[PDB]
């Protein structure tokens, strides 16, 4: 943890104790003694929780908290503590690349070129531009999660979140090396593009390939069956382009419009290419105002559904990001005509099924947005942030999750909520927003009822058997990956059995197991890691 921020140790049990000691491990000296807070029952975990507050101790070092007979694992106080996990999480995207060979000396991850057949992936249906079965080059991009499919909604939202991390602290990222393996992104590296932007461009390049001539965007690339726990270069079965959706077309437009702004200082032609693509997508959407989600039978036989049959929050993001990037006030008129509700409220954490906050963030940073409506959107952000602070401040684990929030992707949700707190802090600075955001990083790294980090490679306990075909087939730790997190609703055979057989029933915050097949809680995905990168950006030391 950081010298200038709050410092609590959360203790489950230990009801009979009254005091704690913070001990410097190098000297054995007690640097701080205090009284424990009162024990309070935590609904989501079933734990009775108290905490040791030593925030006023600011000296860097390695320490342990003693309570009664027990002493915590060593932990650090230091300004530099979040730089390493930020770097690991960001470079994990490089290690997820598809269509290239990877030989990474940092982790030892090695694989041959994978999914070369994506250069001729077959369209699963007939459309005005391709006969069914016709090949399209949709190579490149990132493998989505523990599988090797590539999906526009999560690709666009993850890329956007990473670009917002760039925009939060460009000077941090200009001097941050991701130790890109040999052979990767050679033209971009020769041009001196910052490593984070090199990596994001690999995904944007792929997203561009998913757009068809009329501006609409296909849904995903995958096979007709799920591969086993095999290296990606062994997944030789035919690959297809599946689906067509307006919500994904709009997310593509948002990501491309954001990329146009982000890349313009570096690559004027590429930035223009992104902006023109974003506008073709927006024009498709304006001419096709009703939502579409195409479903052909079999398209989910080897890949996830990522189904949304409405699209308002994503159309709003597309228009608002275009407003921000282009300064064309016609987008403000369009937004005020169709999306006035999102200018007055409805803030919610970013995820692939709801990008309202990406749109609100774009709007409040748009020079040509109406000033009174920008004020309204700032108030929507602060109302949501204030709610998160209220929840976390009264929660024994300082968590922004409620008992009913332990659904698939809860760890993403915790970090998406932290992201929202940081965006609120940007428009209306408030130390409570910063501190509560940082509390979700403490939670993510293991200060939680499950007793484990949900980011690989970090924490006394962390996921060692993530549902991840590359990790499993190569037996190589890839640090920095965020797994779904505790999920009391089930969805895989391991969790389904645990939840149905347990008596007493499992408490939602503990509905997690570290097993290869527990994909409803233990699978990492690009859109889980992305908000973690964003949040850690704020707290990482520059140099
Ligand atoms: Zn691949």
Residue numbers in the entry: 1 to 543
Show the paper's wording.
J30, an endoglucanase with activity against p-nitrophenyl cellobiose (pNPC), which produces cellobiose as its primary product, was identified and analyzed from metagenomic data originating from a switchgrass-adapted microbial community. Its likely source is the moderately thermophilic bacterium Thermobacillus composti KWC4, and its catalytic optimum is 50°C. It is annotated as a GH family 9 member consisting of an N-terminal Ig-like domain and a C-terminal catalytic domain. The predominant architectural element of the catalytic domain is an (α/α)6-barrel structure composed of 12 α-helices arranged in an alternating pattern as is typical within GH family 9 as well as other families.
Using the CtCel9A crystal structure as a reference model and comparing the geometry of its Zn2+-binding site with the corresponding segments within J30, we created a mutant called J30 CCH (denoting the residue identities of the mutations: A98C, G114C and Y143H). The crystal structure of J30 CCH was solved to a resolution of 1.46 Å. The crystal structure of the triple mutant showed the successful introduction of a Zn2+ ion at the intended binding site. The Zn2+ ion is located at a distance of 14 Å from the center of the active site towards what would correspond to the reducing end of the bound substrate. The root-mean-square deviation between the backbone C, N and Cα atoms of the crystal structures of the wild-type and triple-mutant enzymes is 0.094 Å, i.e. they are virtually identical. In the crystal structure of J30 CCH we observe a lower average isotropic B factor than in the crystal structure of J30 wt. The local atomic displacement parameters of the residues neighboring residues 98, 114 and 143 show a similar trend, suggesting stabilization of the mutated site through the introduction of the Zn2+ ion. Our design of a mutant version of J30 based on structural data further underlines this relationship. Here, the majority of the increase in stability is likely to be a result of the net exchange of a hydrogen bond between the side chains of His115 and Tyr143 (J30 wt) for four coordinating bonds between the Zn2+ ion and the side chains of Cys98, Cys114, His115 and His143 (J30 CCH). The incorporation of the Zn2+ ion increases the temperature optimum of J30 for pNPC turnover by 5–10°C, and its influence on catalysis is merely physical and not chemical.
